[PDB]
């Protein structure tokens, strides 16, 4: 579970494990795929997707997911998590605002991202309905058995941990997690690399002038922009994405039927939608003479139909056609 710098972490820029990168309000189904720097899913070892492992300290905390909250302008709905990554059904929102509850603390993370949800169709809803026609939307999956893409996930760079740099009663005293690789020296001249167990520091004294580092590359990370490079190498760790964008047919929009009214080679149409509906036509002469107008306000319109025919498209309701001799 990677940890990075959340931008407006409740107060201001903290370093949250759930630091939000790559917000994708690019689908249609009320859904956003998000990456936390935290890797929830199974535990550290082997069990139960519905548990929760973020970083506390240098360490993980692979425990229950109890009170996740993604949210935006309104509280979102989770869809599924896998890896670093969560899918959640959100409404539109100027921002994105994520957070669980460990239990002692709220411990959330928030971010800017322009979000919208147009459904696919000539109706510009704000939200998916219960009914209407199905038609080919873009949307992310529920599932994990997924390989359609993979993002590079090589090592972490080092990280700071000044909990290490204690004092040896006059000298600044570094320690190690588990024998991990601590990269160490101070502004003064003393040990210059640091690949060690718990060292002391002969020369410097102040904690604030030393290299508290953790080369702990036993587990790779996501290659966040808010990661410091592991300077050594491009290690392996090519790793999939679960939530591929797929060609789901969203349960989708439908605009109320029109009121057809006859006139001489002319369609008066008293019209009354639910939401802004893009109407348009095609006078089937080799003179096309089409028309487009989003209609949200109910409006009686007109169409000079010709002899050979016109067609009529009340939103994603199917196209009509008309003989006006």
């Amino acid at each position: 579970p990677y940890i990075a710098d959340c931008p407006n972490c409740g107060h201001s820029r903290c370093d949250s494990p759930i630091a939000i990168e790559e917000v994708r309000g690019d689908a249609h189904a009320g859904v956003i795929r998000i990456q936390t720097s935290a890797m929830f899913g199974l535990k550290t070892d082997g069990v139960d997707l519905a548990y929760m492992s973020f970083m506390n300290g240098k360490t993980q905390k692979s425990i229950k997911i109890d009170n996740l909250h993604v949210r935006t302008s309104a509280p979102c709905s989770l869809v599924s998590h896998h890896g670093y990554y969560i899918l959640a059904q959100c409404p539109p929102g100027d921002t994105v605002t994520v957070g669980f509850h460990d239990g002692p603390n709220r411990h959330t993370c928030t971010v800017a991202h322009k979000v919208e949800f147009r459904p696919v169709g000539r109706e510009k809803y704000r939200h998916p309905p219960e009914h209407g026609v199905e038609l080919p939307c873009n949307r992310y999956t529920h599932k994990r058995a997924d390989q359609g893409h993979y993002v590079e996930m090589h090592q972490p760079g080092l990280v700071a941990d000044h909990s290490l740099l204690s004092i040896h009663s006059a000298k600044v005293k570094i320690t190690v997690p588990s024998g991990a690789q601590v990269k160490y020296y101070c502004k003064c001249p003393d040990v210059r690399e640091g690949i060690t167990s718990s060292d002391h520091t002969t020369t410097c004294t102040d904690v604030k002038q030393c290299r508290a580092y953790l080369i702990d590359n036993k587990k790779w990370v996501y290659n966040s922009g808010r990661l410091p490079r592991g300077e050594g190498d491009t290690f392996k760790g090519k790793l999939h994405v679960p939530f591929v964008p797929v060609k789901a047919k969203c349960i989708a929009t439908l605009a109320p039927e029109p009121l057809v009214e006859h006139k001489h080679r002319t369609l008066i149409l008293h019209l009354h939608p639910d939401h802004p509906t893009l109407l348009t036509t095609r006078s089937l002469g080799s003179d096309a003479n089409p028309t487009r107008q989003w209609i949200e306000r109910p409006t009686t319109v007109n169409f000079t139909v010709t002899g050979e025919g016109l067609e009529y498209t009340w939103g994603n309701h199917p196209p009509k056609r008309v003989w006006a001799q």
């Binding site: 370093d15 790559e22 690019d26 893409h149 990280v159 700071a160 000044h162 290299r211 922009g225 964008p245």
Partner: protein
């Protein structure tokens, strides 16, 4: 639509890290100095101006590029077709593509 899939920047703590123009598409990279990068322990690089930060970002196809993508074409004339039914004469049927 692009995805600015940023490679994770370098942070050299005392002195410069010259960037090179990697061949990634639109590989934008610019060295930066004068930082003091707060990373989980306050800052970590002990210098104060020699703290260097090299940001690099290239453009990459979205995952939606595979599936939700516009598509240009140079379009010539080709050759038109039809599933012409003839319920002919007394034959009464043929529905053929021509």
């Amino acid at each position: 639509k692009y995805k600015t899939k940023v490679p994770s920047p370098v942070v050299k703590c005392c002195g410069a890290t010259q960037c090179t123009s990697k061949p990634h598409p639109d590989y934008q990279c610019q060295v930066f100095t004068g930082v003091y990068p707060f990373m989980w322990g306050g800052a970590y690089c002990f210098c104060d101006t020699e703290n260097t930060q090299m940001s690099e970002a290239y453009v990459e196809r979205s995952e939606e590029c595979s599936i939700d993508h516009a598509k240009a074409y140079k379009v010539h004339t080709g050759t038109v077709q039809a599933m012409v039914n003839i319920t002919y004469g007394s034959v009464s049927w043929r529905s053929a593509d021509v």
